[PDB]
Design a protein around this ligand. Structure first.
Ligand SMILES: Nc1ccn([C@H]2C[C@H](O)[C@@H](COP(=O)(O)OP(=O)(O)OP(=O)(O)O)O2)c(=O)n1
Ligand SMILES: [Ca+2]
Ligand SMILES: [Ca+2]
Ligand SMILES: [Ca+2]
Length: 341
DNA sequence: GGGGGAAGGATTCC
DNA sequence: CGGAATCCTTCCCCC
């Protein structure tokens, strides 16, 4: 089995360099402005020029501007990158439509029938890469190996504009020396827990007692890591696609006034519906970040689809429910529709 | 003991 | 001082 992975280099930031090439060679920074008055928000992504001075994804627009006050800060136009994305995905769609669209800028292609041997697999990466760069001037990185996870790791290493193949022997070595931190689906909050239990690499997950792990990193993530350490990992390449659509916003101020929140909630719904389109959702969740930035969401699953009218209808009580079981001040508020039909 | 789901909490950037 | 989703663990009715 040979899986070819593709990941768009600094996607958002880059796309903006396509619609306005004057920025390349310059620090570009895509941002999300909340509006709770100026500079407030976060960073979505930053090109490499920007990254090398400390500007990464996740930092407050203010702390970033202290590093590059002369950098270009563009608000995020997700709808744009989305289209640009779909294009690169449909182009890929046929190099093996036994492909999985992981995210707005990720995909997995099972090139088993379409080819064998890495040599060729590689030569089909520049092929794929070359095409995308030509047809859309976007630089991407490719990963190749026996399974999805490792294919990604190959790409994550040689980025950007890279193409790396890490098959069989190297796999063993990574299972031995790769840093647990760097394992797909292993964020910060999971990496440290993992050090505590004395694990810093994949292989180490075979020395610890299966229970200590479920005990801490959840039976879910637990089985995952072990499976990898035994290079007994294998999950087909099947386009697994979106199972929830929502919209969340920041109230100009924090509060517990039902009639003050209501408007943002009704704006979130309205937009969620529009983005839902023809897809009919059977479950609805009212979400609201507390000021200590926690996440409390009260939902519901009907035995049938939700008409916008109903969305409005239940959204209110789910919201009333929340206030009714928590206490904190709701900073941001929204809704999320799932269980489509 | 466990299927089958709905619900609420946490985590990753999937 | 963001925003979108997913992941995942506990609760629940009941055969
Ligand atoms: N806290 C975060 C983290 C990431 N993203 C966005 C940034 C990108 O728009 C998208 C994909 O980011 P990746 O990390 O997968 O890849 P990058 O876009 O960062 O490029 P690169 O992997 O080459 O660094 O996720 C976000 O909105 N908020
Ligand atoms: Ca990327
Ligand atoms: Ca990515
Ligand atoms: Ca990591």
């Amino acid at each position: 089995m040979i899986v070819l992975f593709v990941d768009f280099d600094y996607f958002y930031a880059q796309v903006e360099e396509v619609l306005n090439p004057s920025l390349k060679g310059k620090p570009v920074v895509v941002c999300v402005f909340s509006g709770r008055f100026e500079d407030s928000g976060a960073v979505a992504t930053a090109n490499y020029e920007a990254r090398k001075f400390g500007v990464k994804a996740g930092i407050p627009i203010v702390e970033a501007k202290k590093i590059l006050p002369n950098a270009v800060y563009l608000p995020m136009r997700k709808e744009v990158y989305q289209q640009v994305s779909s294009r690169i995905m449909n182009l890929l769609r046929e190099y093996s439509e036994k492909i999985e669209i992981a995210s707005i800028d990720e995909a997995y292609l099972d090139i088993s029938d379409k080819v064998r041997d890495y040599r060729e697999a590689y030569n089909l990466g520049l092929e794929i890469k070359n095409k995308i760069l030509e047809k859309e001037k976007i630089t991407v990185t490719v990963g190749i190996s026996k399974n999805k996870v490792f294919a990604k790791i190959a790409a994550d290493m040689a980025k950007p504009n890279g193409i790396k193949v890490i098959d069989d022997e190297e796999v063993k070595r990574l299972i031995r020396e790769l840093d647990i931190a760097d394992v797909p689906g292993i964020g910060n909050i999971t990496a440290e827990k993992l050090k505590k239990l004395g694990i810093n690499k994949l292989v180490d997950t075979l020395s610890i007692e299966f229970d200590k792990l479920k005990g801490m990193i959840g039976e879910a993530k637990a089985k995952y890591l072990i499976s990898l350490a035994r290079d007994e990992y294998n999950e087909p390449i099947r386009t697994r696609v979106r199972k929830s659509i929502g919209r969340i916003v920041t109230m100009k101020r924090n509060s517990r006034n039902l009639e003050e929140i209501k408007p943002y909630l009704f704006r979130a719904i309205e937009e969620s519906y529009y983005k839902l389109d023809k897809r009919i959702p059977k479950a609805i969740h009212v979400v609201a970040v507390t000021e200590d930035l926690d996440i409390v969401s009260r939902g519901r699953t009907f035995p049938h689809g939700i008409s916008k009218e109903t969305a409005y209808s239940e959204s209110v009580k789910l919201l009333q429910k929340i206030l009714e079981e928590d206490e904190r001040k709701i900073r941001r508020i929204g809704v999320r529709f799932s269980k489509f039909i």
